[PDB]
Symmetry: C3
Subunit: 87 residues, 3 copies
């Protein structure tokens, strides 16, 4: 099992992405109890990074399934496929 961890803002919020059994899932902290996030994509490996637009977060998750990495983007309303490509 493999994880990635990010955080932002004043609280801060934290997100932890976990890859296990070719599934990546997301656990979330926003100042209170941890909960399960909306992120669900395939992969055996995961990295993530984020930045702020004021108080709004932008997240990029790099989900590797085998020999291919797909970027997934959170920009405030849902996860979308990003433009990232590898070599």
């Amino acid at each position: 099992m493999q994880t990635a961890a990010i955080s932002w803002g004043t609280t801060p919020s934290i997100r932890v992405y976990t890859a296990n059994g070719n599934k990546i899932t997301e656990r979330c902290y926003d100042g209170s109890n941890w909960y399960t996030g909306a992120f669900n994509q395939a992969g055996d490996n995961v990295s993530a990074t984020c930045w702020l637009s004021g108080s709004a977060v932008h997240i990029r998750v790099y989900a590797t399934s085998g020999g291919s990495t797909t970027e997934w983007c959170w920009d405030g309303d849902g996860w979308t496929r990003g433009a990232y490509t590898g070599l």
Copy 2:
């Protein structure tokens, strides 16, 4: 063997966590030489995130051993278990 890397401030301070077998250890830089960190917990995989509130550093390390992830927290006065649970 696997690592996670974090940094903060302008110097900067850097921490590098290494999972080797089922042990995670920590190497530190605060502007002079690399030194040995106090973090020692179990895991075959590690991720980490950090932030400064003013001058106060806060670190969260996600230590995964098999299918279980434990959060360890540094907030200026020792490492303690965080509330994180996985799926």
Copy 3:
């Protein structure tokens, strides 16, 4: 295959390091297209972190091959081997 992701700024800039087949390579975004970076070193595992000194980015990439981790540094004028050791 395994990745590490960093970002900085508000645009943002993003770098994704991919360890694939005992090599680590880099893909880059600074606001328009993804392009291939100059980073290329051995490794089966990778982590990275970065900071800004004024407007100048500094990156550290921790490349692990087997039981050895090597630090690679970007400070505005090529990648250089860093002083990091695990012990």
